Design a protein around this ligand. Sequence first.
Ligand SMILES: [Zn+2]
Ligand SMILES: [Zn+2]
Ligand SMILES: [Zn+2]
Ligand SMILES: [Zn+2]
Lengths: 167, 49, 196, 262, 143, 783, 115, 66, 171
Amino acid sequence: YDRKVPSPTGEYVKEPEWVLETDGVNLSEVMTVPGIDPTRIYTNSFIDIMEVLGIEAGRAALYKEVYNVIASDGSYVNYRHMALLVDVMTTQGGLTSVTRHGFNRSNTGALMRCSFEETVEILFEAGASAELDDCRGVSENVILGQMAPIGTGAFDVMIDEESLVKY
Amino acid sequence: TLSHLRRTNTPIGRDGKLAKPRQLHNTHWGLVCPAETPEGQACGLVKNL
Amino acid sequence: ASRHGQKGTIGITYRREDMPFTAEGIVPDLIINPHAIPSRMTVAHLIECLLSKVAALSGNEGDASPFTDITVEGISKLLREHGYQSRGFEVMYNGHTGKKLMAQIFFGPTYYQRLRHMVDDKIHARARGPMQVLTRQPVEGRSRDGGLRFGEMERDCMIAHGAASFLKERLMEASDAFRVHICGICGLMTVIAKLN
Amino acid sequence: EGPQVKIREASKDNVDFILSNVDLAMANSLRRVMIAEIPTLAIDSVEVETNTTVLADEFIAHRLGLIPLQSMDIEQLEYSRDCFCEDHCDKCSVVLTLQAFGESESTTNVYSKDLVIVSNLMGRNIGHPIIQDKEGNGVLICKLRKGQELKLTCVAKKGIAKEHAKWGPAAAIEFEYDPWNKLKHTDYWYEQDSAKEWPQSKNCEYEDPPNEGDPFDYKAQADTFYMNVESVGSIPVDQVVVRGIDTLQKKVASILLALTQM
Amino acid sequence: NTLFDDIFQVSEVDPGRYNKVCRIEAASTTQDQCKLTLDINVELFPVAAQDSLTVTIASSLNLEDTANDSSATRSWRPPQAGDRSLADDYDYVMYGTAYKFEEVSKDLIAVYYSFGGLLMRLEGNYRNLNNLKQENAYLLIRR
Amino acid sequence: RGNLMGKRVDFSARTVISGDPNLELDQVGVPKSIAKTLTYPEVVTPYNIDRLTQLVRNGPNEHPGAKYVIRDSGDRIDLRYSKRAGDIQLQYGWKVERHIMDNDPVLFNRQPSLHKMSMMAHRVKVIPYSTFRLNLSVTSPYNADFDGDEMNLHVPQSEETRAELSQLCAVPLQIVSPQSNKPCMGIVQDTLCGIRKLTLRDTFIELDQVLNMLYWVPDWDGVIPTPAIIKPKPLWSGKQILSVAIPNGIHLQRFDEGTTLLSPKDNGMLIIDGQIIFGVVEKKTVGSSNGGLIHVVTREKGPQVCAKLFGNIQKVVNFWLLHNGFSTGIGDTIADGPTMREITETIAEAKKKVLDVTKEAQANLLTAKHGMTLRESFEDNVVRFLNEARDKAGRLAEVNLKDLNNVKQMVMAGSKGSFINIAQMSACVGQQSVEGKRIAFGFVDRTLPHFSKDDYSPESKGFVENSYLRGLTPQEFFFHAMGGREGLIDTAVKTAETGYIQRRLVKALEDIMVHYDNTTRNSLGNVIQFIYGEDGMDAAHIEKQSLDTIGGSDAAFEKRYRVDLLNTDHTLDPSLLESGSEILGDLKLQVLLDEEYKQLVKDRKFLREVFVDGEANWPLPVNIRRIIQNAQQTFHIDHTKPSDLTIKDIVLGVKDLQENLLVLRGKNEIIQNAQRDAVTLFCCLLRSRLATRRVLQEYRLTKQAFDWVLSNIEAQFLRSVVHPGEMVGVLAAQSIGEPATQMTLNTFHFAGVASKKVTSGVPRLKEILNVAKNMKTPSLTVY
Amino acid sequence: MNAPDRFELFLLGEGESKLKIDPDTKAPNAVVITFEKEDHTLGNLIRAELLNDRKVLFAAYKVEHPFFARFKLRIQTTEGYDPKDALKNACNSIINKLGALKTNFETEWNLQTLA
Amino acid sequence: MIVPVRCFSCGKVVGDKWESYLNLLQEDELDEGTALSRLGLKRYCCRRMILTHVDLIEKFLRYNPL
Amino acid sequence: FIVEDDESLGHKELKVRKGHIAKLMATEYQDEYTWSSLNEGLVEYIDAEEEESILIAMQPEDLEPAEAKRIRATTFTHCEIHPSMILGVAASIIPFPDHNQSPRNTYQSAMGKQAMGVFLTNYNVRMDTMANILYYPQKPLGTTRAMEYLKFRELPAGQNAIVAIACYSGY
RNA sequence: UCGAGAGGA
Ligand SMILES: [Zn+2]
Ligand SMILES: [Zn+2]
Ligand SMILES: [Zn+2]
Ligand SMILES: [Zn+2]
């Protein structure tokens, strides 16, 4: 593997090295192996990293894949797009799924949840365990068809008195 | 009008596990058309003889 | 469409005058674009344009056929002897000014076919009409005067755009809409309808 | 006395010639006018009494418009819209009749020999279908067998080809200039040889070859416009070209006339 | 007023995938140290190796003015028919605009021109303060 | 799902879309009916009455009209019938259901709209013939080919719902995709295929044709230029005449491939003050690219200025092209006679290469690669030779073909064409494979009965030696017919799969928005970010800038950045500065030139920790490698004359600016610390650009020019800050839905990293989003 | 249907003169003239003719849209000299040039016989 | 469906031409290329017009009238 | 067809000879020697299973004796009639499908169901819910042998119209 | 209306 690294002169130069790739996932014990860098050593599966290292090192490895998945066909997306979703799955505590189970069981609003996949399932668990709705969720304002706190209705306009008398 | 006559619909379930079926099998030589098939939905499931 | 899968649609019509002409005074029955063939990789089309011209000029119905030992070089030889350029290209003049066109248009009678999809039976526009019997929203189908379904992802766009008030009115009077009276204590459809 | 002309050969339906001291634009504008802006006559409203023929009432109605009619005295006839009559008349319309019955058990063929003008001629060579068949029955209509009937009343009205191609008395204009391509307006596509691959034109004979060696003409201008004009029969091949010049300066006479008005 | 006076000898005629135009390299007589890259059409004007062609640059033409914050004269007027004469005596002739003033070696300089699409490079010295800026300048060729 | 989140709507229309060059970028060709079948309400205001009463008396049929007239009460006067349908009293404060008119903001939807785009505000232009006209260049955000493709709608009703389209959703607003921080639309088809042939040196447009090309620009001043020559005929350079469409006050620089500041191959691009200097126009030059003119045009000039350019280029280019012409034939895809012998000898070495290796596999003397089995290892060797052949056999005809070949020209510009498209059509198709593996033996040990048992030869294993030009053989046919079907089989599922993903993302996203404290939260108040995308910037304002500091040898950084007043060889020539000698040998002023260098060198080492890959080019706000180039064009700075300012002015000026580049105002330390943490990189770039030495050595800045730059960079950065209310998270959902829609429709060839190559695109993306403990790709990199 | 009528292409509408003279405010001594019910047929041979004059500083025609048969025509001439007369002269000269071909060919056809 | 009156590309009358063409290949017994050379069918658009045409009308006629 | 190893005057050749052709042609001329007469043992019906154990000769010319144009065991049991016979209905109507890309032809093997033309002759008498006909239909200029059997030269789908691969404005 | 099938891109 070729690697651009700084020459003692100051300049960054192509300094190749030997990297050994596998077809197995065990880090907990391969890290403990001497004669290998236990810093540069990245496993394909981010799910191990999150459990081995920690959630912030987990979000870090989550982007790497998310990025390369888009970077594959030579497609580019501005960091903040992928660094939002990646952070989204971690900002809960552990790892969050982007399917029925992971996010549709979250702290989120009852009417904002029954929108995605599980419809009558989320409507029964909400009414029986008695829960409130923020009426801040997009789907909620959409259902109600009222001035949503989105761009245009985020803030709230009121009448001014100073420039009313003035003109 | 002819193309609706020399046609073959297939069902689903029971079998069709870690198999094709859609993908043009070698055995479809001469018997079935290699290009006549309806895109998306039942593509490669409904063949024309 | 040609017998290849080149689903063409008209996007303007010109008559004889405006249309370009060969030295013999031949105007094309229609004009395609050079951009179809590389993305589709439709080669059999280019020979169908070709082989049909020889088949028309010789009189003898030229055999297109699938697996037949016939080559374009074999076709070109019979076309060269027919007086016309063997490669198919013909020197054309701009129907507007008369001034010769730098590039020579490929001219050949490709067998085209009309499709059962016409705009006059595709078109629709609804500005308030018959609403759904149960849901009180516009009906479906152009025929029964049915409004265009502003899909789930269309909503997702008015959200992203930051159009909190577009979709606020779009979900209401601009489509469905409704006025009700409810209890402050219970918050349900329970107030008895009288008003007057 | 300025722009010169020389007829190569002239037939009953075609005229081949050459044009000298002429602008290229005016040369191309000449064909444009000859194609569409040439005033002719043809059917516009086909009235039906009875039809039993295997052709749709509108299939026939279309066919007719395409059948050529003598338009030698076109100008005398007035445009229907320009006329003062409550729709149609003799001064703007030429009524026709196509009565037919499949008496002959055979494939009863119908031609121009079957349609009769039922309006006043006004002593003018106009409204006569063009027959060009050896047996004397030009342009085939339809066919009938036994009890099949067709009785019509097709009505001819003025109009130019800019309204419908049926009033197009230019069958196709053969247009060419600079066959040796000294002016170099076209880039010849070639894989081996330019001259060998590209067909040499009939018009090469009537022009000076480039002789080679001498650099391309810097002060280049287009001339020697070779043309063959084909009529359908509606109007004689000589009138076709002359009326093309007549209407063109007319379409220009209108502009200055209006300029003065404003 | 003039801004150049020199003669150059044809060194190379290079089409380079092209047809109507040719890349040209030449050397000056007045100074051997001085060189040129000339881009030039052929169809009308043919070129042959080792030829004496009286080259010139200059700005706006005439004797009077000499002109007061145009700058053109404004837009453009056709060559009339035979009225008004500038430096018509010269053969080929072009119009373009400069862009780069490359610092070669001590006294040596390279000035880049753009004749719409065509380009021009030249070397040596003696040009200095009177050569360019304003960047807009013509081109003249004789015999 | 079908009544609340998406429901049937009133004031909507659908009909087939059509391309048009004579239509504007922000325009819609609403059919002469439709805008007659749809109604916008207007209040009887004194600024419309005469137009309105005329339209009411124009009724619901004579094109611009009105169907209903609403009174002071709940009465709706229907003019389609009515008795006073022609009269109409027309009183103030009354409503009118008026027929849509030209330049009337309206929502345009191409189903399925995934991203923010595909849902623009096209100003109406009512035209005849039953089809929905639309601009050619606006086929990039919708991704719609005009092949009987039909489009949806929604006409706004209130003036406020309309203001939302007009001011937030207008088509030039969406000209730059925050997705890839680069443009959404660019020049395509004929307008791309033509412009290449127009912008070159071999092209000369004669005066007659030229005069009209100038009139075709509706923004053309009336200033006739001077022909690029004189000679016996006055000719014009295609670029020179195109430079007309390019607005004067814009400078572009590229330098690609060759590029020698005088390239003979017309490589790269140079445009100065809306004028073409040198180069050829390609997909890279005009079309949607991270600097490809349009990106510069919008950012530097304006969105309306750019929207106007889009139309200008189209009409002009297309005009020359209708008169120059274009075509393609069988000949355009014909390989030369000697090339035909040489293209066949390419397979001669290949059919030998395979055999020599096959004979090794049969005689048990095969080495058999690591991890792979003997069978696996062999197939991988035989697959390499087949590609090696066709991928070079493709270059064998490509390089051989002349430039006058329009097929090469179609690919040379871009528009519609790639290297593989010529290759298969002209040279050879290659080996067709299903599930990566070649054509397996369906019948026992044989692929077809027309072949013998155990025929591992490429001919019998699925290789297509022939070209499409040569035609195919029954075997070659059925083999490509097998591998061709598989393409469709998967691509249909690939397109159905990307669907469930898009929703999953956007749903889990919704509520996510920038709140009024740069805090990216949601419905709850659960903080996703404290600063949006770690900088609090709107993604459209960001551009790929090279940080000068990080690069070069430590010697070159000192040679370009170290300013030592006390030195003789490491000081400034007083020809650069005004007070050059009066400031020389100074000790109290050198304090800052050391302190500047402390903060300037500090960056290089910190940055090297950040971009460990040693990469300088990064997407960042405010294009400074331009604001400085802008001064040299505007102020016409010398060249000969010294700088009108001193060192005390630079070092402090640059410092005092950083203070003003605010994002978060909050008094407390943490928030001010976060603001420093947010600007960090921008300052690293700013300091790399505004180094006290650089400003004078190459830049040449006066007081007027420098103080302007400081004020420009400040407003441009404060302009660059994110807009609180931005649905940021419903966004960055489809700003990932859209890239995922394509991609996988091309993915195939190359093993070894077989796991990662197969578990790419959508297959591995189900694994990612769903987050499931299933191998597919367990493979760990060992450093 | 939605499509227009075929006669609309040559016929003149409700209050639309075959010519509309307006002055181009962008350039001095310049004019813009719209040709309702008219196409290339005229504009092209008008472009070619106006170019031939020496007093003509500018001449260019533009087919607005192929939908509607109206082309704009911009003419700019020498200071003091009116552009309408530049059009008036050329318009007449074209008829003089045309009338010449009408007769040259007329006699040339009598001379030619026959097939 | 009866010989299509006038060619679509050029515009030359093709009504009378059927009876002649249909016999020419029978009364004289020769190829199409010779018949289309005669009849004055110069350009190919006019030439195809007849050759590529199918006279179904003939088959519709043998259906008893009503 | 059935191929056999014996040839006293040659080497190997299929059981069908130049005498059987004139024998079949006589039946076609008059309207006795049929496909049922090929009971003779000159042709065989090869099952989906029976195909597993067989060897078919592609072109009988290319695959028979000892020893520019497109790219070109000897224990043959049977022989192929024509590789055109591998395609279905609508696929036969496609000219040079071999010269074309495979999915392109798959998209075309659907357009045939959208085509206009004449589907029958009776239609005038035959009352129907939705029917489309062509004013002047035309048989193709380019013919693929199989069309003669599919009656496409008798009941077409479109017309042969002059196609100009042009860049005549941007429409 | 409701539930099944054929196509549209
Ligand atoms: Zn209550
Ligand atoms: Zn009640
Ligand atoms: Zn009267
Ligand atoms: Zn014709």
